[PDB]
Amino acid sequence: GKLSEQLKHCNGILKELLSKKHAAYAWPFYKPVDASALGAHDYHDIIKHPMDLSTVKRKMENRDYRDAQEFAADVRLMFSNCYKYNPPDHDVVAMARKLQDVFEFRYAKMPD
Ligand SMILES: CC[C@@H](C(=O)OC)[C@@H]1N=C(c2ccc(Cl)cc2)c2cc(OC)ccc2-n2c(C)nnc21
Ligand code: NI
């Protein structure tokens, strides 16, 4: 009921993060990191729990998320992975911060 409503809120946020409006900074987070393709051969030694928006979308579509907290923990994990792997002055870190600002301000408007 109110839980369903909280998950619709989460799905709305997800759709927004995937939307054209935010694509300039959201695009690195759309799909799983392909470490080989990027020559980032240390990625999976540093990042033990990869996460990306397509995975979040699959989990939402499959009704994997049972509550908003579970959903938010994955979205936040995605940002954390970026903050852990990359130096803090890299462009992709700025992009992550901007996308997380979008996430956090809308997530905060949680139906209650
Ligand atoms: C994973 C390796 C990291 C990188 O490329 O270091 C070699 C990478 N940087 C980037 C990255 C680097 C520079 C810019 Cl301007 C944007 C993204 C990256 C690029 C992608 O292109 C498909 C997908 C994922 C990432 N990404 C995320 C998310 N977190 N770190 C990265
Ligand atoms: Ni959390």
Side-chain angles (χ1 to χ4, degrees):
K2 183 170 60 172
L3 176 52
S4 291
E5 185 171 353
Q6 291 171 346
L7 287 165
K8 303 293 194 198
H9 176 63
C10 290
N11 197 49
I13 292 162
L14 172 60
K15 294 295 178 174
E16 180 168 2
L17 301 184
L18 293 167
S19 78
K20 181 176 186 193
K21 176 182 188 165
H22 302 295
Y25 38 95
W27 71 263
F29 309 99
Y30 283 169
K31 291 293 185 348
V33 166
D34 185 342
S36 298
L38 297 165
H41 300 299
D42 53 356
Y43 187 79
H44 293 289
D45 301 287
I46 295 170
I47 299 309
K48 304 206 179 189
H49 299 97
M51 188 55 60
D52 71 282
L53 294 173
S54 79
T55 300
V56 177
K57 186 185 170 58
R58 170 179 57 79
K59 289 174 68 165
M60 186 67 75
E61 288 171 349
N62 294 168
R63 285 202 152 221
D64 199 328
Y65 296 122
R66 291 197 65 238
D67 54 47
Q69 290 93 335
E70 191 183 355
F71 162 86
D74 276 355
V75 174
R76 287 164 173 154
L77 170 60
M78 178 184 75
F79 296 129
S80 300
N81 290 341
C82 184
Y83 306 148
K84 186 187 181 183
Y85 182 73
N86 300 279
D89 63 330
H90 280 208
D91 280 344
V92 69
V93 174
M95 297 169 76
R97 292 172 73 187
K98 289 165 70 181
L99 196 63
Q100 182 163 16
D101 190 69
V102 175
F103 172 73
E104 296 290 350
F105 279 77
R106 188 169 168 186
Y107 183 75
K109 303 183 172 191
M110 180 61 59
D112 59 7

Short mmCIF file of all heavy atoms in Angstrom, two decimals, residues 30-84:
data_model
loop_
_atom_site.label_atom_id
_atom_site.label_comp_id
_atom_site.label_asym_id
_atom_site.label_seq_id
_atom_site.Cartn_x
_atom_site.Cartn_y
_atom_site.Cartn_z
N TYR A 30 24.91 3.81 -16.96
CA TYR A 30 23.79 3.14 -17.60
C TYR A 30 23.95 1.64 -17.64
O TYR A 30 22.95 0.91 -17.56
CB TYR A 30 23.64 3.64 -19.05
CG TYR A 30 23.01 5.01 -19.24
CD1 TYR A 30 23.06 5.62 -20.49
CD2 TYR A 30 22.32 5.68 -18.23
CE1 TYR A 30 22.47 6.84 -20.72
CE2 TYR A 30 21.73 6.92 -18.46
CZ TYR A 30 21.80 7.49 -19.71
OH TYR A 30 21.22 8.73 -19.96
N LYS A 31 25.20 1.17 -17.81
CA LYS A 31 25.48 -0.25 -17.99
C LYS A 31 26.62 -0.72 -17.09
O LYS A 31 27.41 0.09 -16.60
CB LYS A 31 25.83 -0.51 -19.48
CG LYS A 31 24.65 -0.34 -20.43
CD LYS A 31 23.58 -1.39 -20.21
CE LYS A 31 22.40 -1.36 -21.20
NZ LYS A 31 22.22 -0.21 -22.13
N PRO A 32 26.74 -2.04 -16.88
CA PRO A 32 27.84 -2.53 -16.07
C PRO A 32 29.18 -2.06 -16.63
O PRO A 32 29.36 -1.99 -17.87
CB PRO A 32 27.69 -4.05 -16.15
CG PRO A 32 26.27 -4.29 -16.52
CD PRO A 32 25.87 -3.13 -17.36
N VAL A 33 30.10 -1.73 -15.73
CA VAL A 33 31.45 -1.39 -16.11
C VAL A 33 32.06 -2.58 -16.85
O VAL A 33 32.00 -3.70 -16.34
CB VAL A 33 32.31 -1.04 -14.88
CG1 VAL A 33 33.79 -1.01 -15.24
CG2 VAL A 33 31.90 0.31 -14.34
N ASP A 34 32.58 -2.34 -18.05
CA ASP A 34 33.30 -3.36 -18.81
C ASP A 34 34.78 -3.07 -18.62
O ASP A 34 35.36 -2.24 -19.33
CB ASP A 34 32.91 -3.35 -20.29
CG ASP A 34 33.56 -4.48 -21.07
OD1 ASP A 34 34.55 -5.07 -20.60
OD2 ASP A 34 33.08 -4.76 -22.18
N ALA A 35 35.35 -3.73 -17.62
CA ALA A 35 36.71 -3.43 -17.19
C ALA A 35 37.73 -3.68 -18.29
O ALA A 35 38.59 -2.83 -18.55
CB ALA A 35 37.07 -4.23 -15.94
N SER A 36 37.61 -4.83 -18.95
CA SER A 36 38.48 -5.17 -20.07
C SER A 36 38.45 -4.11 -21.15
O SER A 36 39.49 -3.62 -21.61
CB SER A 36 38.07 -6.50 -20.70
OG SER A 36 38.18 -7.57 -19.79
N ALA A 37 37.23 -3.75 -21.57
CA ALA A 37 37.06 -2.79 -22.65
C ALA A 37 37.71 -1.46 -22.33
O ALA A 37 38.17 -0.78 -23.23
CB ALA A 37 35.58 -2.59 -22.97
N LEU A 38 37.75 -1.09 -21.05
CA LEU A 38 38.31 0.17 -20.60
C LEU A 38 39.80 0.05 -20.23
O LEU A 38 40.43 1.05 -19.89
CB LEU A 38 37.50 0.71 -19.41
CG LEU A 38 36.03 1.03 -19.72
CD1 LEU A 38 35.19 1.19 -18.46
CD2 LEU A 38 35.95 2.29 -20.56
N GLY A 39 40.36 -1.14 -20.31
CA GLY A 39 41.74 -1.38 -19.87
C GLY A 39 41.91 -1.22 -18.35
O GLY A 39 43.03 -1.05 -17.86
N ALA A 40 40.82 -1.30 -17.61
CA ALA A 40 40.83 -1.09 -16.16
C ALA A 40 41.00 -2.44 -15.46
O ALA A 40 40.09 -2.95 -14.81
CB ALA A 40 39.55 -0.40 -15.71
N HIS A 41 42.17 -3.05 -15.60
CA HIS A 41 42.35 -4.45 -15.17
C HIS A 41 42.38 -4.67 -13.68
O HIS A 41 42.36 -5.82 -13.22
CB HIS A 41 43.61 -5.03 -15.81
CG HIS A 41 43.56 -5.01 -17.29
ND1 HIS A 41 42.60 -5.70 -18.00
CD2 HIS A 41 44.26 -4.30 -18.20
CE1 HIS A 41 42.73 -5.45 -19.29
NE2 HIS A 41 43.74 -4.61 -19.44
N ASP A 42 42.37 -3.57 -12.92
CA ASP A 42 42.28 -3.60 -11.46
C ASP A 42 40.87 -3.33 -10.93
O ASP A 42 40.67 -3.33 -9.73
CB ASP A 42 43.27 -2.60 -10.82
CG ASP A 42 43.14 -1.18 -11.37
OD1 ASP A 42 42.34 -0.94 -12.30
OD2 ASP A 42 43.82 -0.28 -10.86
N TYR A 43 39.90 -3.12 -11.82
CA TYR A 43 38.58 -2.66 -11.39
C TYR A 43 37.92 -3.65 -10.42
O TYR A 43 37.40 -3.26 -9.39
CB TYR A 43 37.67 -2.42 -12.60
CG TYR A 43 36.38 -1.77 -12.16
CD1 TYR A 43 36.33 -0.42 -11.89
CD2 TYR A 43 35.23 -2.54 -11.97
CE1 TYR A 43 35.14 0.18 -11.49
CE2 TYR A 43 34.04 -1.96 -11.55
CZ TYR A 43 34.01 -0.61 -11.30
OH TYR A 43 32.85 -0.05 -10.85
N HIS A 44 37.92 -4.92 -10.80
CA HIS A 44 37.24 -5.97 -10.02
C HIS A 44 38.05 -6.44 -8.81
O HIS A 44 37.54 -7.20 -7.98
CB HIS A 44 36.84 -7.13 -10.94
CG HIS A 44 35.78 -6.75 -11.93
ND1 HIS A 44 34.47 -6.52 -11.56
CD2 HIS A 44 35.84 -6.47 -13.26
CE1 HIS A 44 33.77 -6.14 -12.61
NE2 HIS A 44 34.58 -6.08 -13.65
N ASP A 45 39.27 -5.96 -8.67
CA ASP A 45 40.05 -6.19 -7.47
C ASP A 45 39.72 -5.11 -6.44
O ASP A 45 39.78 -5.36 -5.22
CB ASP A 45 41.53 -6.17 -7.79
CG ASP A 45 41.90 -7.21 -8.82
OD1 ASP A 45 41.90 -8.42 -8.46
OD2 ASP A 45 42.16 -6.86 -9.98
N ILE A 46 39.38 -3.93 -6.93
CA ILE A 46 39.01 -2.78 -6.09
C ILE A 46 37.52 -2.76 -5.76
O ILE A 46 37.12 -2.45 -4.60
CB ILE A 46 39.48 -1.46 -6.76
CG1 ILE A 46 41.03 -1.46 -6.81
CG2 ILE A 46 38.95 -0.24 -6.03
CD1 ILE A 46 41.67 -0.37 -7.63
N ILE A 47 36.71 -3.10 -6.75
CA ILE A 47 35.25 -3.08 -6.64
C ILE A 47 34.76 -4.52 -6.59
O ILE A 47 34.76 -5.22 -7.59
CB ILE A 47 34.62 -2.32 -7.85
CG1 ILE A 47 35.10 -0.87 -7.89
CG2 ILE A 47 33.09 -2.43 -7.82
CD1 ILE A 47 34.96 -0.08 -6.58
N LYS A 48 34.33 -4.95 -5.41
CA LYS A 48 33.86 -6.33 -5.21
C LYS A 48 32.36 -6.51 -5.42
O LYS A 48 31.89 -7.65 -5.61
CB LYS A 48 34.32 -6.82 -3.83
CG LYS A 48 35.83 -6.69 -3.68
CD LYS A 48 36.45 -7.67 -2.70
CE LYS A 48 37.96 -7.47 -2.65
NZ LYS A 48 38.68 -8.53 -1.89
N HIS A 49 31.61 -5.40 -5.44
CA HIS A 49 30.17 -5.40 -5.67
C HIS A 49 29.77 -4.37 -6.71
O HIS A 49 29.28 -3.31 -6.38
CB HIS A 49 29.42 -5.15 -4.35
CG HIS A 49 29.70 -6.20 -3.33
ND1 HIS A 49 30.64 -6.03 -2.34
CD2 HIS A 49 29.23 -7.46 -3.20
CE1 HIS A 49 30.72 -7.14 -1.62
NE2 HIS A 49 29.87 -8.02 -2.12
N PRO A 50 30.01 -4.69 -7.98
CA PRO A 50 29.61 -3.74 -9.02
C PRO A 50 28.12 -3.50 -9.06
O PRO A 50 27.32 -4.38 -8.71
CB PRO A 50 30.05 -4.44 -10.32
CG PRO A 50 31.03 -5.47 -9.91
CD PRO A 50 30.63 -5.90 -8.54
N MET A 51 27.76 -2.29 -9.50
CA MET A 51 26.35 -1.91 -9.65
C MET A 51 26.22 -0.83 -10.69
O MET A 51 27.14 -0.02 -10.90
CB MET A 51 25.77 -1.44 -8.30
CG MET A 51 24.26 -1.19 -8.31
SD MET A 51 23.24 -2.57 -8.86
CE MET A 51 23.65 -3.84 -7.70
N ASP A 52 25.08 -0.85 -11.39
CA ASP A 52 24.83 0.10 -12.47
C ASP A 52 23.31 0.22 -12.66
O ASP A 52 22.55 -0.63 -12.17
CB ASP A 52 25.46 -0.41 -13.77
CG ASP A 52 24.73 -1.60 -14.31
OD1 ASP A 52 24.94 -2.69 -13.78
OD2 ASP A 52 23.91 -1.41 -15.25
N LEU A 53 22.86 1.25 -13.37
CA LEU A 53 21.43 1.52 -13.50
C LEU A 53 20.63 0.45 -14.27
O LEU A 53 19.45 0.23 -14.00
CB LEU A 53 21.20 2.88 -14.11
CG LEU A 53 21.64 4.08 -13.27
CD1 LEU A 53 21.50 5.35 -14.09
CD2 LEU A 53 20.86 4.16 -11.96
N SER A 54 21.26 -0.24 -15.22
CA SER A 54 20.57 -1.35 -15.91
C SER A 54 20.28 -2.50 -14.97
O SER A 54 19.26 -3.16 -15.10
CB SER A 54 21.32 -1.86 -17.16
OG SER A 54 22.39 -2.73 -16.83
N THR A 55 21.21 -2.76 -14.03
CA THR A 55 20.98 -3.77 -13.00
C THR A 55 19.87 -3.36 -12.04
O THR A 55 18.98 -4.16 -11.69
CB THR A 55 22.30 -4.09 -12.26
OG1 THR A 55 23.24 -4.58 -13.23
CG2 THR A 55 22.07 -5.11 -11.18
N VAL A 56 19.90 -2.10 -11.63
CA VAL A 56 18.81 -1.58 -10.79
C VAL A 56 17.46 -1.71 -11.51
O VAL A 56 16.45 -2.14 -10.92
CB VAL A 56 19.08 -0.12 -10.32
CG1 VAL A 56 17.92 0.43 -9.50
CG2 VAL A 56 20.38 -0.04 -9.51
N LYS A 57 17.45 -1.40 -12.80
CA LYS A 57 16.23 -1.51 -13.60
C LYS A 57 15.74 -2.94 -13.70
O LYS A 57 14.56 -3.19 -13.51
CB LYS A 57 16.48 -0.96 -14.99
CG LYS A 57 15.26 -0.89 -15.89
CD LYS A 57 15.76 -0.43 -17.27
CE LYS A 57 14.71 -0.54 -18.36
NZ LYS A 57 13.52 0.27 -17.99
N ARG A 58 16.63 -3.88 -13.98
CA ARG A 58 16.29 -5.31 -14.00
C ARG A 58 15.68 -5.75 -12.66
O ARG A 58 14.65 -6.45 -12.62
CB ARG A 58 17.51 -6.18 -14.30
CG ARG A 58 17.21 -7.66 -14.07
CD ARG A 58 18.35 -8.60 -14.37
NE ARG A 58 19.59 -8.34 -13.65
CZ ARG A 58 19.87 -8.66 -12.39
NH1 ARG A 58 18.98 -9.24 -11.58
NH2 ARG A 58 21.09 -8.41 -11.94
N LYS A 59 16.32 -5.35 -11.56
CA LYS A 59 15.84 -5.73 -10.25
C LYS A 59 14.47 -5.12 -9.98
O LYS A 59 13.60 -5.78 -9.45
CB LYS A 59 16.86 -5.37 -9.16
CG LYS A 59 18.09 -6.27 -9.23
CD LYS A 59 19.20 -5.90 -8.27
CE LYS A 59 18.80 -6.15 -6.83
NZ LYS A 59 19.97 -6.14 -5.91
N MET A 60 14.27 -3.87 -10.36
CA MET A 60 12.94 -3.28 -10.21
C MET A 60 11.88 -3.99 -11.06
O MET A 60 10.78 -4.27 -10.56
CB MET A 60 12.98 -1.81 -10.58
CG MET A 60 11.66 -1.08 -10.29
SD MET A 60 11.21 -0.92 -8.56
CE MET A 60 12.32 0.36 -8.03
N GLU A 61 12.20 -4.25 -12.33
CA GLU A 61 11.28 -4.91 -13.26
C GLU A 61 10.91 -6.30 -12.77
O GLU A 61 9.76 -6.74 -12.96
CB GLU A 61 11.90 -5.06 -14.65
CG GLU A 61 12.01 -3.76 -15.39
CD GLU A 61 12.83 -3.86 -16.67
OE1 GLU A 61 13.52 -4.90 -16.93
OE2 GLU A 61 12.79 -2.88 -17.44
N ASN A 62 11.89 -6.99 -12.18
CA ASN A 62 11.69 -8.35 -11.66
C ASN A 62 11.06 -8.38 -10.28
O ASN A 62 10.91 -9.45 -9.71
CB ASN A 62 13.02 -9.10 -11.58
CG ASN A 62 13.65 -9.36 -12.93
OD1 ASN A 62 14.82 -9.75 -13.01
ND2 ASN A 62 12.89 -9.18 -13.97
N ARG A 63 10.71 -7.21 -9.74
CA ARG A 63 10.15 -7.09 -8.39
C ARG A 63 11.11 -7.65 -7.33
O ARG A 63 10.69 -8.20 -6.30
CB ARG A 63 8.77 -7.76 -8.31
CG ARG A 63 7.64 -6.97 -8.96
CD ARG A 63 6.31 -7.43 -8.35
NE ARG A 63 5.29 -6.38 -8.36
CZ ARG A 63 4.45 -6.14 -7.36
NH1 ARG A 63 4.53 -6.82 -6.23
NH2 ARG A 63 3.55 -5.18 -7.48
N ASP A 64 12.41 -7.48 -7.58
CA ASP A 64 13.45 -7.94 -6.66
C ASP A 64 13.44 -7.07 -5.39
O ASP A 64 13.51 -7.59 -4.28
CB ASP A 64 14.79 -7.92 -7.39
CG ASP A 64 15.84 -8.79 -6.75
OD1 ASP A 64 15.86 -8.95 -5.51
OD2 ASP A 64 16.69 -9.31 -7.48
N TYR A 65 13.31 -5.75 -5.56
CA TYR A 65 13.33 -4.82 -4.42
C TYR A 65 12.08 -4.93 -3.60
O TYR A 65 10.97 -4.81 -4.13
CB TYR A 65 13.51 -3.36 -4.88
CG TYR A 65 14.82 -3.10 -5.57
CD1 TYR A 65 14.87 -2.60 -6.87
CD2 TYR A 65 16.02 -3.34 -4.92
CE1 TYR A 65 16.08 -2.37 -7.50
CE2 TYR A 65 17.22 -3.11 -5.54
CZ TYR A 65 17.26 -2.61 -6.83
OH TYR A 65 18.47 -2.37 -7.41
N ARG A 66 12.24 -5.17 -2.31
CA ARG A 66 11.09 -5.33 -1.43
C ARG A 66 10.74 -4.03 -0.72
O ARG A 66 9.64 -3.90 -0.22
CB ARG A 66 11.33 -6.47 -0.44
CG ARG A 66 11.34 -7.84 -1.11
CD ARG A 66 11.15 -8.97 -0.11
NE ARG A 66 9.81 -8.90 0.50
CZ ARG A 66 9.57 -8.81 1.80
NH1 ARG A 66 10.55 -8.78 2.69
NH2 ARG A 66 8.31 -8.76 2.23
N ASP A 67 11.67 -3.08 -0.68
CA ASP A 67 11.41 -1.78 -0.06
C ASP A 67 12.30 -0.70 -0.64
O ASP A 67 13.22 -1.00 -1.42
CB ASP A 67 11.52 -1.85 1.46
CG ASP A 67 12.84 -2.40 1.93
OD1 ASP A 67 13.91 -2.00 1.45
OD2 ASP A 67 12.80 -3.27 2.83
N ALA A 68 12.01 0.55 -0.30
CA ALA A 68 12.81 1.67 -0.82
C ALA A 68 14.27 1.63 -0.33
O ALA A 68 15.16 2.00 -1.09
CB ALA A 68 12.19 3.01 -0.44
N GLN A 69 14.48 1.21 0.91
CA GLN A 69 15.83 1.15 1.47
C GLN A 69 16.73 0.22 0.65
O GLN A 69 17.90 0.53 0.41
CB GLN A 69 15.79 0.69 2.93
CG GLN A 69 15.21 1.72 3.89
CD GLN A 69 13.71 1.57 4.16
OE1 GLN A 69 12.95 1.03 3.35
NE2 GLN A 69 13.28 2.07 5.33
N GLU A 70 16.18 -0.90 0.20
CA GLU A 70 16.97 -1.85 -0.60
C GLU A 70 17.39 -1.24 -1.93
O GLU A 70 18.54 -1.37 -2.36
CB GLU A 70 16.19 -3.16 -0.81
CG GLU A 70 17.03 -4.27 -1.40
CD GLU A 70 16.22 -5.53 -1.68
OE1 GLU A 70 15.01 -5.61 -1.36
OE2 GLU A 70 16.81 -6.45 -2.27
N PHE A 71 16.45 -0.54 -2.56
CA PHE A 71 16.66 0.14 -3.83
C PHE A 71 17.73 1.21 -3.65
O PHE A 71 18.71 1.30 -4.41
CB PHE A 71 15.34 0.74 -4.32
CG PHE A 71 15.48 1.82 -5.36
CD1 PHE A 71 15.58 1.50 -6.72
CD2 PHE A 71 15.48 3.16 -4.99
CE1 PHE A 71 15.69 2.50 -7.68
CE2 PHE A 71 15.60 4.15 -5.94
CZ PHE A 71 15.71 3.83 -7.29
N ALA A 72 17.57 2.04 -2.62
CA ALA A 72 18.52 3.14 -2.41
C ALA A 72 19.93 2.64 -2.13
O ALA A 72 20.89 3.27 -2.56
CB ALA A 72 18.06 4.04 -1.29
N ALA A 73 20.04 1.55 -1.37
CA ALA A 73 21.35 0.98 -1.07
C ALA A 73 22.09 0.58 -2.37
O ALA A 73 23.32 0.78 -2.47
CB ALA A 73 21.20 -0.20 -0.12
N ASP A 74 21.37 0.05 -3.37
CA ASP A 74 22.02 -0.28 -4.66
C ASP A 74 22.43 0.96 -5.45
O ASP A 74 23.52 1.02 -6.03
CB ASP A 74 21.12 -1.15 -5.56
CG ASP A 74 21.20 -2.65 -5.24
OD1 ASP A 74 22.03 -3.08 -4.38
OD2 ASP A 74 20.44 -3.38 -5.90
N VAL A 75 21.56 1.97 -5.49
CA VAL A 75 21.87 3.17 -6.26
C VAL A 75 23.10 3.84 -5.62
O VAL A 75 24.03 4.24 -6.30
CB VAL A 75 20.66 4.14 -6.32
CG1 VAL A 75 21.05 5.45 -6.98
CG2 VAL A 75 19.49 3.49 -7.05
N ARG A 76 23.11 3.87 -4.29
CA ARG A 76 24.22 4.47 -3.56
C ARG A 76 25.50 3.65 -3.72
O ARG A 76 26.58 4.23 -3.84
CB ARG A 76 23.82 4.71 -2.11
CG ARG A 76 22.87 5.88 -1.97
CD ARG A 76 22.20 5.88 -0.63
NE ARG A 76 21.38 7.07 -0.40
CZ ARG A 76 20.35 7.11 0.43
NH1 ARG A 76 19.99 6.02 1.12
NH2 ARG A 76 19.67 8.24 0.56
N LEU A 77 25.38 2.32 -3.75
CA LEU A 77 26.53 1.45 -4.02
C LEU A 77 27.20 1.81 -5.36
O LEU A 77 28.42 1.92 -5.46
CB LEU A 77 26.10 -0.02 -4.03
CG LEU A 77 27.08 -1.07 -4.53
CD1 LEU A 77 28.37 -1.11 -3.71
CD2 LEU A 77 26.41 -2.43 -4.54
N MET A 78 26.37 2.06 -6.37
CA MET A 78 26.89 2.44 -7.68
C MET A 78 27.79 3.70 -7.58
O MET A 78 28.91 3.74 -8.12
CB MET A 78 25.71 2.67 -8.60
CG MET A 78 26.03 3.14 -10.00
SD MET A 78 24.53 3.47 -10.93
CE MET A 78 24.09 5.03 -10.15
N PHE A 79 27.31 4.72 -6.86
CA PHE A 79 28.09 5.93 -6.69
C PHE A 79 29.37 5.66 -5.90
O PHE A 79 30.44 6.12 -6.26
CB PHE A 79 27.24 7.01 -6.01
CG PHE A 79 26.04 7.45 -6.83
CD1 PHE A 79 24.74 7.49 -6.28
CD2 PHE A 79 26.21 7.85 -8.16
CE1 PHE A 79 23.67 7.90 -7.08
CE2 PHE A 79 25.14 8.26 -8.92
CZ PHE A 79 23.89 8.31 -8.38
N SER A 80 29.25 4.89 -4.82
CA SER A 80 30.38 4.53 -3.96
C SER A 80 31.48 3.85 -4.75
O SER A 80 32.64 4.14 -4.56
CB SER A 80 29.98 3.60 -2.82
OG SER A 80 28.99 4.17 -1.97
N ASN A 81 31.10 2.92 -5.62
CA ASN A 81 32.10 2.25 -6.44
C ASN A 81 32.90 3.25 -7.24
O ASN A 81 34.12 3.12 -7.37
CB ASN A 81 31.43 1.23 -7.36
CG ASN A 81 30.89 0.04 -6.62
OD1 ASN A 81 31.29 -0.24 -5.49
ND2 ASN A 81 30.02 -0.69 -7.26
N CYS A 82 32.22 4.24 -7.78
CA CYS A 82 32.88 5.29 -8.56
C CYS A 82 33.81 6.14 -7.69
O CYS A 82 34.92 6.44 -8.10
CB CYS A 82 31.82 6.15 -9.27
SG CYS A 82 32.43 7.42 -10.37
N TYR A 83 33.35 6.51 -6.49
CA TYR A 83 34.16 7.25 -5.55
C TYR A 83 35.36 6.46 -5.04
O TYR A 83 36.35 7.06 -4.64
CB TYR A 83 33.33 7.75 -4.35
CG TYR A 83 32.10 8.54 -4.72
CD1 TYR A 83 30.97 8.50 -3.91
CD2 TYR A 83 32.08 9.40 -5.81
CE1 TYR A 83 29.85 9.22 -4.22
CE2 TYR A 83 30.95 10.12 -6.14
CZ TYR A 83 29.84 10.02 -5.35
OH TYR A 83 28.72 10.74 -5.67
N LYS A 84 35.28 5.13 -5.02
CA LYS A 84 36.37 4.31 -4.51
C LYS A 84 37.44 4.12 -5.58
O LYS A 84 38.64 4.17 -5.29
CB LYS A 84 35.88 2.95 -4.02
CG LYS A 84 36.96 2.13 -3.34
CD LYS A 84 36.55 0.72 -3.02
CE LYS A 84 37.70 0.01 -2.32
NZ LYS A 84 37.38 -1.41 -2.04
#
